[PDB]
Amino acid sequence: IVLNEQLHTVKFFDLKIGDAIRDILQLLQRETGVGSSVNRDTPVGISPNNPERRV
Amino acid sequence: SYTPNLTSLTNQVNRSERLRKWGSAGVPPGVPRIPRLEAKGIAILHESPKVILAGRSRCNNFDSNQYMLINKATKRCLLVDASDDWPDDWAAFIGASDLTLTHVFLTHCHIDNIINLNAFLTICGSRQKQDEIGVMWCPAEECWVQNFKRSCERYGRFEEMHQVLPMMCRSLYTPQHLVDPVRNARHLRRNDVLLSAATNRATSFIDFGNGVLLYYIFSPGHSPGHMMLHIPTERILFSGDLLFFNKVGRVDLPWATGVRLAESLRLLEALPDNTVVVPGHGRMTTLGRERRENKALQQCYQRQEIGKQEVSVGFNEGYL
Amino acid sequence: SFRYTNNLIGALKHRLLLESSYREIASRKFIGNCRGVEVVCSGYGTVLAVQLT
Amino acid sequence: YHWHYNLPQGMERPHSVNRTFAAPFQSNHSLVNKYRGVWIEFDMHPAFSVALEPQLRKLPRGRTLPKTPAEEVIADYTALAPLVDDEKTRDLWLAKVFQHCAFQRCGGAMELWERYCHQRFTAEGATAKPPLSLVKSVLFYCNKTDNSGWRALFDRCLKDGWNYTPLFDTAQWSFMLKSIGRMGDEDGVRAVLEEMLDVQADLDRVEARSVVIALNAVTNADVYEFVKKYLFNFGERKVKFLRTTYSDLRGHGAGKLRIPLKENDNMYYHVCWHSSIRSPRQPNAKIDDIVKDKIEKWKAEGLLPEDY
Amino acid sequence: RKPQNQWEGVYYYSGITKRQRHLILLHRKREREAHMRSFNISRASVLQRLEQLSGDRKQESLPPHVRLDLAVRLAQHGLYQQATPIVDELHHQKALHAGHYALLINALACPRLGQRILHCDAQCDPALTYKLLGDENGEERAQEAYRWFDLALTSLAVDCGHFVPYLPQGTAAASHITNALMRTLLTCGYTHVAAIPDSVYDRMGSMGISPTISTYELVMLALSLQGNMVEAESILSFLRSHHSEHITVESFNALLLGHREARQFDCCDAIWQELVDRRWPRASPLTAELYLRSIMDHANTPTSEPLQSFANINVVEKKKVPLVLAQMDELGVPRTHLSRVLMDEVEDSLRKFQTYRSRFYEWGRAVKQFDFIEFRRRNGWLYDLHLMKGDIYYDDTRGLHDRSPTWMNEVPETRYDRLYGVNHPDIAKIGIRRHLNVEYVNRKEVVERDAALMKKTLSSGRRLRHRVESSR
Amino acid sequence: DPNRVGLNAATLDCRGRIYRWLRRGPFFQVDNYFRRSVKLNRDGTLPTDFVHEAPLMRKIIRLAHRGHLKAACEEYRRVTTVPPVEVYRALTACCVPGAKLADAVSIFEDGDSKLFYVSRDGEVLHNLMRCAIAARHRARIMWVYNVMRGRFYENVVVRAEVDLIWRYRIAMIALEYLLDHECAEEAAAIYSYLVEEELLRCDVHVRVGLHMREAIAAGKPITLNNDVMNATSLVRDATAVAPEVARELQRRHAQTLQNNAVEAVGAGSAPWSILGPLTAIGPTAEDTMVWLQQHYGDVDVMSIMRWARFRKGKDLMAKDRPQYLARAAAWIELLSKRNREMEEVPLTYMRKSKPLVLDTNSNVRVAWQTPLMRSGGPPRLL
Amino acid sequence: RRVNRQKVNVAASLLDNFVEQEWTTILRDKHDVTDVTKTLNDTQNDKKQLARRLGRYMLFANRSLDDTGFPT
Amino acid sequence: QNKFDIMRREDRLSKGEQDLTERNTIHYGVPIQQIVDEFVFRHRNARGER
Amino acid sequence: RMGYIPRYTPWEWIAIQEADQPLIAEQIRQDNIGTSYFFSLNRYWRYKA
Amino acid sequence: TLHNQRSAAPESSVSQSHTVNAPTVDECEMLAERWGTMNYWHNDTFPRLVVFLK
Numbered sequence A: 001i002v003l004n005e006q007l008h009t010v011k012f013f014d015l016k017i018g019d020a021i022r023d024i025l026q027l028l029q030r031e032t033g034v035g036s037s038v039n040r041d042t043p044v045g046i047s048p049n050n051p052e053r054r055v
Numbered sequence B: 001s002y003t004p005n006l007t008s009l010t011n012q013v014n015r016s017e018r019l020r021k022w023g024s025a026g027v028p029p030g031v032p033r034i035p036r037l038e039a040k041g042i043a044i045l046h047e048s049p050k051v052i053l054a055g056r057s058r059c060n061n062f063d064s065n066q067y068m069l070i071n072k073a074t075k076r077c078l079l080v081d082a083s084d085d086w087p088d089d090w091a092a093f094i095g096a097s098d099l100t101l102t103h104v105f106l107t108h109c110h111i112d113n114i115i116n117l118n119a120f121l122t123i124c125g126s127r128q129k130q131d132e133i134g135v136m137w138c139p140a141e142e143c144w145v146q147n148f149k150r151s152c153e154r155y156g157r158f159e160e161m162h163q164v165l166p167m168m169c170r171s172l173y174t175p176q177h178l179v180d181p182v183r184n185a186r187h188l189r190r191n192d193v194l195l196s197a198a199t200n201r202a203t204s205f206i207d208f209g210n211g212v213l214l215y216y217i218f219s220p221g222h223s224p225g226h227m228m229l230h231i232p233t234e235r236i237l238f239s240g241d242l243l244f245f246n247k248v249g250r251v252d253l254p255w256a257t258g259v260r261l262a263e264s265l266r267l268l269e270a271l272p273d274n275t276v277v278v279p280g281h282g283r284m285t286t287l288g289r290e291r292r293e294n295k296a297l298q299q300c301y302q303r304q305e306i307g308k309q310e311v312s313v314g315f316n317e318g319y320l
Numbered sequence C: 001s002f003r004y005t006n007n008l009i010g011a012l013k014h015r016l017l018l019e020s021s022y023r024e025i026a027s028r029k030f031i032g033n034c035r036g037v038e039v040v041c042s043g044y045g046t047v048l049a050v051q052l053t
Numbered sequence D: 001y002h003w004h005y006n007l008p009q010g011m012e013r014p015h016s017v018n019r020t021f022a023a024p025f026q027s028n029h030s031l032v033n034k035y036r037g038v039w040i041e042f043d044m045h046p047a048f049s050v051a052l053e054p055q056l057r058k059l060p061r062g063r064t065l066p067k068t069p070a071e072e073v074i075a076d077y078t079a080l081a082p083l084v085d086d087e088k089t090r091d092l093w094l095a096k097v098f099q100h101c102a103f104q105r106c107g108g109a110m111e112l113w114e115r116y117c118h119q120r121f122t123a124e125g126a127t128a129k130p131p132l133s134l135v136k137s138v139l140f141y142c143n144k145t146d147n148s149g150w151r152a153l154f155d156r157c158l159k160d161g162w163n164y165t166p167l168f169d170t171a172q173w174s175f176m177l178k179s180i181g182r183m184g185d186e187d188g189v190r191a192v193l194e195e196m197l198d199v200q201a202d203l204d205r206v207e208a209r210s211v212v213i214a215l216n217a218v219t220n221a222d223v224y225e226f227v228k229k230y231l232f233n234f235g236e237r238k239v240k241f242l243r244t245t246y247s248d249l250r251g252h253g254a255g256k257l258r259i260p261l262k263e264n265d266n267m268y269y270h271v272c273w274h275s276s277i278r279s280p281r282q283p284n285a286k287i288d289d290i291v292k293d294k295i296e297k298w299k300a301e302g303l304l305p306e307d308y
Numbered sequence E: 001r002k003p004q005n006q007w008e009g010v011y012y013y014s015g016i017t018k019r020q021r022h023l024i025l026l027h028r029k030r031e032r033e034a035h036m037r038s039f040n041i042s043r044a045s046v047l048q049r050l051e052q053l054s055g056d057r058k059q060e061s062l063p064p065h066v067r068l069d070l071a072v073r074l075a076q077h078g079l080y081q082q083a084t085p086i087v088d089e090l091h092h093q094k095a096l097h098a099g100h101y102a103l104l105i106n107a108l109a110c111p112r113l114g115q116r117i118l119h120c121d122a123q124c125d126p127a128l129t130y131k132l133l134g135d136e137n138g139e140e141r142a143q144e145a146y147r148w149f150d151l152a153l154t155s156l157a158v159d160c161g162h163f164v165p166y167l168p169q170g171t172a173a174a175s176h177i178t179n180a181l182m183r184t185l186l187t188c189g190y191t192h193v194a195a196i197p198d199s200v201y202d203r204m205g206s207m208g209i210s211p212t213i214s215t216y217e218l219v220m221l222a223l224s225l226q227g228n229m230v231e232a233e234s235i236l237s238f239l240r241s242h243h244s245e246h247i248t249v250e251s252f253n254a255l256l257l258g259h260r261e262a263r264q265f266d267c268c269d270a271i272w273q274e275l276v277d278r279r280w281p282r283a284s285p286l287t288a289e290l291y292l293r294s295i296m297d298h299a300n301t302p303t304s305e306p307l308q309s310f311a312n313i314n315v316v317e318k319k320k321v322p323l324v325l326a327q328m329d330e331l332g333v334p335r336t337h338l339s340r341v342l343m344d345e346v347e348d349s350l351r352k353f354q355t356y357r358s359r360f361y362e363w364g365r366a367v368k369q370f371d372f373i374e375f376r377r378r379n380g381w382l383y384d385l386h387l388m389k390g391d392i393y394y395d396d397t398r399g400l401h402d403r404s405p406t407w408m409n410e411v412p413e414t415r416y417d418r419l420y421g422v423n424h425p426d427i428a429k430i431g432i433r434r435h436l437n438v439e440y441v442n443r444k445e446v447v448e449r450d451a452a453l454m455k456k457t458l459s460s461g462r463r464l465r466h467r468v469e470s471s472r
Numbered sequence F: 001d002p003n004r005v006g007l008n009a010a011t012l013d014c015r016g017r018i019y020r021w022l023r024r025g026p027f028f029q030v031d032n033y034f035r036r037s038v039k040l041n042r043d044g045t046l047p048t049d050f051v052h053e054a055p056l057m058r059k060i061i062r063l064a065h066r067g068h069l070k071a072a073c074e075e076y077r078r079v080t081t082v083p084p085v086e087v088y089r090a091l092t093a094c095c096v097p098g099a100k101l102a103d104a105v106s107i108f109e110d111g112d113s114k115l116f117y118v119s120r121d122g123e124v125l126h127n128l129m130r131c132a133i134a135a136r137h138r139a140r141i142m143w144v145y146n147v148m149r150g151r152f153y154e155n156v157v158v159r160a161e162v163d164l165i166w167r168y169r170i171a172m173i174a175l176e177y178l179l180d181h182e183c184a185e186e187a188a189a190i191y192s193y194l195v196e197e198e199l200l201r202c203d204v205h206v207r208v209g210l211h212m213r214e215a216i217a218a219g220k221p222i223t224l225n226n227d228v229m230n231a232t233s234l235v236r237d238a239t240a241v242a243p244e245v246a247r248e249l250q251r252r253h254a255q256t257l258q259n260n261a262v263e264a265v266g267a268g269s270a271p272w273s274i275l276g277p278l279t280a281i282g283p284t285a286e287d288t289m290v291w292l293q294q295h296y297g298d299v300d301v302m303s304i305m306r307w308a309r310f311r312k313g314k315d316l317m318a319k320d321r322p323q324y325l326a327r328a329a330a331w332i333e334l335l336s337k338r339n340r341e342m343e344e345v346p347l348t349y350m351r352k353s354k355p356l357v358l359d360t361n362s363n364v365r366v367a368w369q370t371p372l373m374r375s376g377g378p379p380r381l382l
Numbered sequence G: 001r002r003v004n005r006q007k008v009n010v011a012a013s014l015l016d017n018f019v020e021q022e023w024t025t026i027l028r029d030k031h032d033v034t035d036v037t038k039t040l041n042d043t044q045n046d047k048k049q050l051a052r053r054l055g056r057y058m059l060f061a062n063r064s065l066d067d068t069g070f071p072t
Numbered sequence H: 001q002n003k004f005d006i007m008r009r010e011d012r013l014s015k016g017e018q019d020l021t022e023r024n025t026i027h028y029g030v031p032i033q034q035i036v037d038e039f040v041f042r043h044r045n046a047r048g049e050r
Numbered sequence I: 001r002m003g004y005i006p007r008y009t010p011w012e013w014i015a016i017q018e019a020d021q022p023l024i025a026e027q028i029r030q031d032n033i034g035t036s037y038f039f040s041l042n043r044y045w046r047y048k049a
Numbered sequence J: 001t002l003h004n005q006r007s008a009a010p011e012s013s014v015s016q017s018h019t020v021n022a023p024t025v026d027e028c029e030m031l032a033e034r035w036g037t038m039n040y041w042h043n044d045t046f047p048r049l050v051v052f053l054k
């Protein structure tokens, strides 16, 4: 049982390397700036957990 | 082309080049197999009391040519630069001529020369079944053997990708396999010769039989190991990719140097003008016509005369 | 961040509702009967009156 | 390369793309059924509506704007409203009078605020809280006639005050920023834009002509550094539309505005710089110590001679 | 040309922004605070009325109906302890009668606290109102309901003083008070809900009280909240067999709620289709509420047999939602009489599965498809499920070749082209020319060209054979 | 702007414009000609006010007021601009006296979602509801009520919602028809809407508002209190009538209980009607209000009796007294849930059962018998 | 802890045997007294009438640890 | 999360019936046709059973 | 198996292909009023018959 | 490895509309107002018209 999980993760070393590069590829295609007001749940200048959140 | 790393994927100039070259597709169309239509038959180019040269022009969409030398006495034939999209006409020609195929000469291991090599060896050995065919090649082309798959990637040759090349199998120059004690079709190929770059006019030849000698000449510039065939009794120079009609080989491919191509053109000046030069691509010419009417040789000797120590000549657009 | 301040507001709302309801229970009468015997108590459990209806 | 016809023509693999990616609806054209105006939420009790019905007839109702002149409407409120003994009825009546004077641009309607509502809402610490329908109507009025009385009312709507800013419309902020850019209040642009950022308003769906007018009036150096950091809060589709709107309102389409813009070149070049950025490509004491000993060395070596 | 995928769907927008979901959550929070404020204001008014009637009227005895209305308004707001001395005084004065006891027991089920628990606590799930009303003193209100039931039966035995050994158990008042007891015991905890068809029904049978349709509907709803569906379907089968003209929609609502709680959604679909088929009793908005909530509970259910290999499977049941809504337009059930949470889920499933004809003419334009691709490329980290991470029965001996003439009809063009040199010794069996066996469109010309080429190379090979073997 | 009416078009010059013309949608000419034309203005009003199309609207309204529906529909086909709301009002009011419900629904749906919600109006929906009453279509009554209530799009985004007076009128005539024809669930839904919107005392508010309009035309100050609403003739007349309504309700429930006890046996009487759930009424009008509030207190009895007063304009309370009492008693008995729960027919007792010990059938079961059915034997458990 | 769980189950079943012994005692013995207070028009509180209005006895051996005082 | 559901689960487990929380996920486990086809494929057309 | 292609598309793949594409609202074709004999062929010019 | 769903037999194709079962005692009670086919009153086994006359 131990060796089966140890051999399962060594065959995904190269596939996780290319997975990490594909993270950087979709990262640099993101919309620039701090974001857009259409796609936000939080106001920009404060934490979402601020007690004085809604002015 | 090359491996798509992180820098090539985040480059906008790469997408700009792939839009400029190929339009809205972005992917290069490969070099496909010639169909059974628009395919010509095998021509007998030369007949002599010693040998017979039989060839076929434009046998690939690389526009390469396929040639075979036949010994009239020993009934032995020899393919040079085995790259034909249909090696079924050649096996039928050998079987209807009662010939034996013993070796295949390879000038260099680019994809326009070794694309159908396993097909040649398999079909001719299957006809021999009703001693195997050897391969004669230069070990510097080892660096072009390993990129046979990548070249099959870019030019769309997908069915020839997953094929172990016969030059990669264990010859007599290699260590042997230590098989379990409880097979020899692919484990050992005893008929294999490796040509040496130290080519001379004394002993660098192949005994073709009947006193016909084929002198292989080491001439880089288009490849790290590039071997011409020279038959002085027949005045025939299989140049391969070094020299063509009014043009020379490319240097804009990897492992290709212009000054090596210039030295390879300079080691050709001791042959007579009536030597018919037979190129891997296009129409055949003579060496005197290339001394008179080829601008690459004119530029090479002009740069040599005006005092260039490193004369670099070579094409950037032409035949692979 | 602000996990202490947002948890202190929820605790003081729990304490304010438990204080305002303790002042509702203590100022109230709790009458229990068995057989005509009205035992009246306050929120603190002190017997205010043992009556008979 | 292909699929042969004697092969079974089954589906190879199903594709669930619309259930993996749920896309919100986004068109380049605006919504054809939106109100494009400031809504007042007339919430009158259904007994004063029948009573004041000849007076509310000449007032703007839902998506209807009568052509009654404003001097008749103010004269109707001056006489008839003290007869009505209800506080919320008179306040909602004056919300329609402020809305009617805004659409006709009568600058004399701010005296109705000082007459009735100022002493009980905005004078010397008034404890009363005005209705939201009244503050929306007077802020829409002061922005339409370019009145300077918006500033005392907007400061009352903060979290310490009436807290009416989370209930403001996106068109309420659109008519707000257009007036402050016309008057040219640099601190008024910053105090509104800080409030829109804190209240989490729809910054991308503000009117683009309203933003480029409020940004054109930025000339002071400290508020100019605020606009640089604030302009990243817009989207990439918005900030490329602000450049095309700013170039048109100062260029050929300068006749769309009632009052023409003033020449602010430092904001024109920075908006054009910022829109190109968001779009894709297509130790003084120790250093001065070193300088003094070098000049000391060249005088001792003779490279800096004295008078000959 | 490269082929396009015909099993890939057209890219269309089915979803909302983060801002729209945040504004929906904010508005629903505001509505919950508004309902809480309304209930607290009404409860404060009732407690102020009680303090006024207890302080100012210390020695002046009130009329009995004012105290009865005050006890009803106290018990309806979940204040049962402030109402039971009023009921003890009213029963001791013999001022209460047959209807007043049922009114008090029905008020003990608190149908004003239930509205607040509906709109704020249960999030408008009507089964969750019964599940959450048992927390606010279920056992104590159950004991008070049992005590008031005993008080009611004693006063009914007093008020009935022929049919003398069969009173008051044969009257309508005993059945009405028993129905009020069951309706109040449904509000309490799970023990009393389970005791409604167990102890209360057996006690009503042993007392000899004839039930009504509300008795069977409340027993069916108690078995629905228990999760026992075979007994509730047995009770509705009893009602279908014997008293079929009296069945109202509350039994269908009981079965819908119960099969929703037992998670047998196919039975929910069967009950809804039966209710659409018979059209009588009329479907309330509670029917559409329970059925659409069963649909949303089945669609959000994860499965484990494909083990989520590609996507979630049950989401396609939300495609049933634009059908059933149209059925509501045939049933006269207004869709605006749905709760806000269920309306949010119904508009979610409608923007996922509904299109009109005018959008269907424009939804496949390449501009919108490439905008979908660009929006997935730019911000797909915000909306992605993976980025969060003869006859055969009389045939037995088949008759073959029955002299059916194939030469009367015309099938003459059966020509085939075989490759040249099938048995030729000089032509190899294996070759690339085997790829010529799979080619249909230009078959005849390719076979003729291959045969001509093979004949030419075999002729040239034998000619060279003869010339070389004759030259030496 | 009568001078600048007109639209310029293109010439399709370059090859890309030809390719765009060959890639255009099925409605590209009419769509761009419609959106380049009239649209919602900057301040939010409709584009209705058109100079060149003004007398056509007058002709349509003039033909739809004289009863010519087909000619008004024919010159409605000739419109280019968005037509006014008065066109839809006149067309739907022409559809009322012929009971043509489908034409009125089509008239509403033409301008509803296509033409910037011009037919989403109180008078148009009122005439639609009147067509639905004239066609006796209950599902279309609930459809007109549901489109009157509206959704988030038409109310908040479009800001085109129905006024409160028109909503009360539409819901009142719908509730009147649904209570007159014994439709319990639909009338319960409309009554729950009137409870939720707090419109139970709205007719009194319209009467008080008309009185206050006359008073403010005189010059007197106006206010709204409890005694101002109690001073109207409607509340006084309902409070005067209410003992007769209570006696009618008690008599009708006694007859219903006696019929239930007769039909429980099969006609003699059962012990079902010995003691019913209604108590006797006290001999006081305050005791009458007490009895109506403690036996029918789930509904507003006074508002129901005020609504049931008029019938098609005729005052039933002053002219046809037993008809008005029967109507008000029927409406109270329909809208009250407690009256529905207290007027139930006695059903037989369903006995439990167990499977057999020796299993012969799966349908044959041993029934649980009450000791009332079989006397004697041992006392049993649960 | 596996031993102490069995110490609880033998101690809970001792009390559940005693409570269900007395609950059957005070119900059945009071069935033989027959104190008739229906003429008194009382509030129906009694020794039996509070015991029969109380629910079924939830056994302590049936309860988990969190129902007998352990925190969740 | 509800005490009602916990009491219902304990009641159903005392009755000896299926818990409704185990019905939270749908299992369309191993149809008989797939089991028969796997048995035939594993046993090479299942000679002796025919 | 080595070359198994199914001749019946599985229920999961049918469910995935059904769950990805929306419905057309005019496929329900419900009708309860009747035909508009006067207005339906004389409606507004963009949406006209 | 089994299924957690409700296992139910498929619905019977035996036509219950034409299946005349044994007469129950409640059927003999409500036989005075029972609507039956002509096969129902003159059945080969358990005829209901004889029960109605008896």
Ligand SMILES: [Zn+2]
Binding pocket: B108, B110, B112, B222, B223, B241, B319, B320
């Ligand atoms: Zn080459």
Ligand SMILES: [Zn+2]
Binding pocket: B064, B110, B112, B113, B240, B241, B280, B281, B319, B320
């Ligand atoms: Zn070459």
